[PDB]
Amino acid sequence: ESLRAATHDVLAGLTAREAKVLRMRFGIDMNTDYTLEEVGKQFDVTRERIRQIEAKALRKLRHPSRSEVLRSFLD
DNA sequence: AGTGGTGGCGCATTATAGGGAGTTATTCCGGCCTGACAAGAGGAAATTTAAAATAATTTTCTG
C-alpha cells in the first residue's frame, strides 16, 4: 500500500504524458499492460520513440533524492 | 519265464507372459512479434567573448 501511494505521488511529480506512458507500459493503477506498439498507437506516434520516452523517463528518475525514498523499498 | 510296472516321451490340456494396438498426456521444434542498437535531421537553450558604461585611482590644476 505504501509503495503504491509513493509511486503514485512521484509519478505525479513527473510530466503528464511521460507519466501516462509509464503507467501504460506497466500495470500501474491500470489493467493489462499493452506492448509498446499499442501505446504508441495510443499517442499515434508508434515506433522506437516510445521506448526513447521510456528510457528518458527512467534516466530522469535515476537522479537521487527522489527515488531514495523508494530505494527504501528494496531489501 | 511272463505279465505287469516304470520311466520317458507324446498328446492333450492348462497357464503365464509379452507384444501390439490403442489412447492420453507430457514434451520438443519452429515462426513471428517485441526489444534493443545505430544513425540521421531540424530547431532551440546555454556559454563565451567583445564592446560600452558607473564607480574608484591617478594626475593635474587652482586656491
Curated annotation (Swiss-Prot):
Marked site (Interaction with anti-sigma factors) residue numbers: 25
Region named Sigma-70 factor domain-4: 10-63
DNA-binding region: 36-55
Origin: domain of life: Bacteria
Role played: Sigma factors are initiation factors that promote the attachment of RNA polymerase to specific initiation sites and are then released. This sigma factor is the primary sigma factor during exponential growth. Preferentially transcribes genes associated with fast growth, such as ribosomal operons, other protein-synthesis related genes, rRNA- and tRNA-encoding genes and prfB.
Known partners and oligomeric status: Interacts transiently with the RNA polymerase catalytic core formed by RpoA, RpoB, RpoC and RpoZ (2 alpha, 1 beta, 1 beta' and 1 omega subunit) to form the RNA polymerase holoenzyme that can initiate transcription. Identified in a complex containing RpoD, the RNA polymerase subunits RpoA, RpoB and RpoZ, CRP and DNA. Interacts with Rsd; this prevents interaction with the RNA polymerase catalytic core and with promoter DNA, and as a consequence, promotes transcription from promoters that require alternative sigma factors.
Name assigned to this protein: RNA polymerase sigma factor RpoD
Organism: Escherichia coli (strain K12)
Part of the whole protein covered: 538 to 612 of 613
